[PDB]
Design a binder for this molecule. Structure first.
Ligand SMILES: COc1ccc(C(F)(F)F)cc1CC(=O)N1CCS[C@H](C(N)=O)C1
Ligand SMILES: [Zn+2]
Length: 139
């Protein structure tokens, strides 16, 4: 679990969105595993606007943060869940690191701010859904 809070927005994995998230829907993209909902309280997370390929992510299954090198956002294969079956997920970045399904929602950050959230993983790899391109999160 986990979310990004920026301005009047809440960013979560689409497969983990709640009834409230869907009732206050701003935008969702199944191909990215992202959903953004509106909030009454003001968010203070800074979104990075950069092309960093190094950062630190939070891993709930270990109660630890890990430094990682990660790939550029691209189209990558994702097996089936109760949330999606074999398909290409766009805007995904891979890193060598530990993750378990419950790790989805952990933030990946670089010196510029929030880069994305954990969205997949498997075989010693961790996948992050990028959010740096969503320029509208700040306006
Ligand atoms: C970070 O999640 C992990 C991590 C590891 C494993 C391992 F296979 F090893 F059991 C499994 C998962 C779970 C997973 O990847 N998915 C399920 C939720 S929807 C997600 C997607 N965005 O399509 C795909
Ligand atoms: Zn950066």
């Amino acid at each position: 679990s986990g979310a990004i809070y920026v301005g009047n927005y809440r960013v979560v994995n689409r497969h983990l969105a709640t009834h409230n998230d869907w009732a206050n829907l701003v935008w969702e993209d199944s191909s990215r595993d992202l959903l953004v909902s509106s909030t009454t309280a003001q968010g203070c997370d800074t979104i990075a606007r950069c092309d960093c390929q190094t950062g630190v992510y939070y891993c709930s299954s270990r109660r630890k943060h890990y430094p990682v090198s990660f790939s550029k956002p691209s189209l990558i294969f994702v097996e089936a869940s109760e949330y999606y079956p074999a398909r290409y997920q766009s805007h995904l970045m891979l890193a060598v690191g530990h993750s378990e399904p419950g790790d989805c929602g952990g933030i990946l950050r670089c010196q510029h701010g929030v880069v994305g959230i954990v969205s997949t993983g498997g075989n010693g790899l961790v996948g992050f859904a990028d959010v740096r391109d969503l320029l509208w999160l700040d306006e």
